[PDB]
Amino acid sequence: AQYEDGKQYTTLEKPVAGAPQVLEFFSFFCPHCYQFEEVLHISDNVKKKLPEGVKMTKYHVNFMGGDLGKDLTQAWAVAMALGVEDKVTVPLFEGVQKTQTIRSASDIRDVFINAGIKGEEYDAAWNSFVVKSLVAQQEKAAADVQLRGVPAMFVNGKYQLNPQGMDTSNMDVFVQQYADTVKYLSEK
């Protein structure tokens, strides 16, 4: 076939019931994640090709960057709660990997402040139980698939994208192959 289990995707032996339709995991410490977000714009190109009625979910992970890694998972929860993902994703990536100006929870906070979220509102969210439960959800989803690496994408809790099995000579062509595979898996 043109799409083969074990080539552009793998199947989870242990399928996850009730999982989000399209679920992506990343870390702000993750070098291919930086590429995926700022050079390839994967999440974006996947969206553009998903059929109608399918929602996209993106979660941060704890297993890179130690203490700061967890702060970032909590910050990403804040970003989800306030709906400001598209305002903080780039400066968080560049702050961790490009300028290396993010070294503490306070430095993460500065990124949101500079993005125009009010201090009061950031701190209120940071300390909220709604954000605590969003951190819980991110952890549970990663746990439900025994996640040990990022970037990662899962479709309907049954299929896991496998980008290693795709030609990367051309970045445009890689992105579309990736996106078209998520669409194929989505319609499965």
Side-chain angles (χ1 to χ4, degrees), residues 3 7-9 36 42 160-170 173-182 185:
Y3 294 104
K7 194 29 177 263
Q8 301 103 316
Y9 68 96
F36 265 44
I42 292 290
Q160 180 182 347
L161 275 288
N162 181 37
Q164 293 84 0
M166 306 181 186
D167 186 359
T168 62
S169 49
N170 179 301
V173 167
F174 167 75
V175 176
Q176 289 325 317
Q177 180 173 11
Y178 197 96
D180 288 342
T181 302
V182 180
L185 291 175

Side-chain angles (χ1 to χ4, degrees), residues 10-32:
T10 53
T11 308
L12 302 183
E13 297 155 23
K14 287 214 55 215
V16 177
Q21 291 172 288
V22 176
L23 183 49
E24 188 177 338
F25 295 94
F26 78 111
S27 170
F28 286 112
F29 281 95
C30 160
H32 289 130

